[PDB]
Amino acid sequence: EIQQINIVGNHAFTTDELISHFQLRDEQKQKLAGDLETLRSYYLDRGYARFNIDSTQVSLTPDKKGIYVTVNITEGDQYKLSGVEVSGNLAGHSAEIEQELYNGTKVTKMEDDIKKLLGRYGYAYPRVQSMPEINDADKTVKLRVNVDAGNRMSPLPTVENQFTPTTAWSTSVGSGIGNFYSNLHPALADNVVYAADRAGLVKALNADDGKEIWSVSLAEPALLSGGVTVSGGHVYIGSEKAQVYALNTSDGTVAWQTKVAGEALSRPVVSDGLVLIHTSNGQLQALNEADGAVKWTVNLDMPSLSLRGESAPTTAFGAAVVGGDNGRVSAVLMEQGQMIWQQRISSDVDTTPVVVNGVVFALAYNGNLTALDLRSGQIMWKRELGSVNDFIVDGNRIYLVDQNDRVMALTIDGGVTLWTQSDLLHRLLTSPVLYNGNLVVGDSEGYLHWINVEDGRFVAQQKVDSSGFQTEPVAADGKLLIQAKDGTVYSITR
Numbered sequence: 419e420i421q422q423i424n425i426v427g428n429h430a431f432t433t434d435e436l437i438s439h440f441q442l443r444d445e446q447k448q449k450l451a452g453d454l455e456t457l458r459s460y461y462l463d464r465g466y467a468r469f470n471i472d473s474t475q476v477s478l479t480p481d482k483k484g485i486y487v488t489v490n491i492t493e494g495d496q497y498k499l500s501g502v503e504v505s506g507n508l509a510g511h512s513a514e515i516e517q518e519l520y521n522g523t524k525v526t527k528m529e530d531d532i533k534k535l536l537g538r539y540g541y542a543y544p545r546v547q548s549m550p551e552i553n554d555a556d557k558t559v560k561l562r563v564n565v566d567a568g569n570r571m572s573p574l575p576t577v578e579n580q581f582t583p584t585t586a587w588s589t590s591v592g593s594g595i596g597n598f599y600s601n602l603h604p605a606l607a608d609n610v611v612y613a614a615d616r617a618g619l620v621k622a623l624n625a626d627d628g629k630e631i632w633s634v635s636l637a638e639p640a641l642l643s644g645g646v647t648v649s650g651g652h653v654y655i656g657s658e659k660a661q662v663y664a665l666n667t668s669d670g671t672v673a674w675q676t677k678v679a680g681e682a683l684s685r686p687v688v689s690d691g692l693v694l695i696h697t698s699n700g701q702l703q704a705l706n707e708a709d710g711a712v713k714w715t716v717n718l719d720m721p722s723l724s725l726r727g728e729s730a731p732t733t734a735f736g737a738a739v740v741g742g743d744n745g746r747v748s749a750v751l752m753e754q755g756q757m758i759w760q761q762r763i764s765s766d767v768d769t770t771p772v773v774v775n776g777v778v779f780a781l782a783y784n785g786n787l788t789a790l791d792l793r794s795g796q797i798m799w800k801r802e803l804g805s806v807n808d809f810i811v812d813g814n815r816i817y818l819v820d821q822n823d824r825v826m827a828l829t830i831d832g833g834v835t836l837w838t839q840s841d842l843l844h845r846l847l848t849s850p851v852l853y854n855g856n857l858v859v860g861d862s863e864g865y866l867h868w869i870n871v872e873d874g875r876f877v878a879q880q881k882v883d884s885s886g887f888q889t890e891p892v893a894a895d896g897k898l899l900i901q902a903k904d905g906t907v908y909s910i911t912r
Contacts, residue, residue: 462522506565541568579878587628594905649688656682674710689733714754725767741768759795837874860887
């Protein structure tokens with residue numbers, strides 16, 4: 419099963435229609451090549467010579483099947499036919515064969531007729547190769563045709579919970595991310611909650627009240643996937659349509675918009691007048707806070723099957739430590755993204771380092787959870803547990819969620835386990851956060867599970883929203899928040 423096919427760089431035609439001829443919505447690499455050519459054929463049939471497919475990316479959600487496809491193109495300009503030239507060993511049929519917008523099909527259609535016409539005369543294996551001669555100066559294509567002739571999921575567990583948690587408020591935010599593996603999640607700063615819908619809708623809510631204070635549509639679905647960050651009175655959101663938006667907290671009006679190299683899936687991190695983004699084409703990118711202009715850009719590298727991403731960095735004194743596939747951490751200085759050191763920690767993909775302090779903590783799908791030297795890249799120690807979802811380092815420990823919705827407290831020193839909870843196995847769980855000294859996380863069936871940190875046992879268990887959970891629970895300013903797949907945003911209170 420595949421969840422989505424995307425096209426990035428497509429401004430002439432709308433995405434859903436070029437796709438519509440794709441034979442790939444179906445439940446495999448062999449055919450994608452077939453459809454990359456439908457993609458081309460389609461542009462070359464509309465005079466878009468000098469059209470290019472830069473990158474093709476196959477992704478797979480953490481739940482072990484929800485294949486994602488992204489086709490990064492760079493759309494050419496329009497070119498008309500300047501004329502036709504017919505050359506080669508025809509050589510006396512040169513008059514019978516020789517007798518608008520550039521149509522790649524028509525050309526190839528032409529080819530076949532030239533290839534077939536000689537076929538009537540017994541030329542069984544003649545080969546023609548027609549190259550478009552282009553001048554970008556006046557945007558026209560001259561077609562030249564040389565020719566050679568033929569020779570002739572585990573259940574819930576029971577829980578005795580005191581406390582009883584309880585929802586303080588709920589406010590709708592469109593149709594949410596749905597099953598689309600997003601990273602979108604609320605954010606709070608100075609008392610307003612900023613959440614968004616994958617379609618484009620963005621809302622700002624009273625934290626204490628839960629009531630809109632401004633709403634805006636950023637649409638052509640925006641396809642928001644990375645967010646929501648907040649810093650310096652801005653609201654940074656990245657979309658799968660390769661666009662990063664910065665909004666004023668006050669009116670929710672677009673401060674700036676930046677074209678990015680690819681799908682901005684990661685949460686944007688704002689340290690030091692910057693916004694670091696990780697794109698699905700393995701691009702780490704920095705842009706100014708005020709104008710959103712690209713300062714530097716680094717190609718991390720990427721494989722054929724991958725995350726659904728992307729590792730969002732940490733800032734450690736003018737370094738960005740970022741992971742992502744290939745499956746190795748990359749620490750780059752901030753102006754201008756010069757590789758210092760790259761250490762492999764290893765489907766080898768990766769997720770957000772924590773730095774506390776001079777030591778980097780990484781996790782990758784499959785093995786493994788690493789602790790690293792910030793300044794040199796050494797591995798101080800390791801494990802064989804991972805997931806592509808985040809992990810907090812409160813105190814001298816590490817509370818993670820494992821590949822299989824396992825839960826673990828491990829020391830900061832050793833990743834010697836203290837405890838493990840495993841009754842939520844394969845329940846498709848969120849990232850872990852502490853709220854009032856208790857570890858809280860949600861799952862695809864809607865509950866939020868409050869686990870204590872001394873032992874591993876559920877102190878509480880609740881049902882908030884049948885639609886399910888997938889995105890980070892956000893705990894800040896004594897307020898816990900989480901947003902569902904349906905889009906509904908919640909503020910829980912004990």
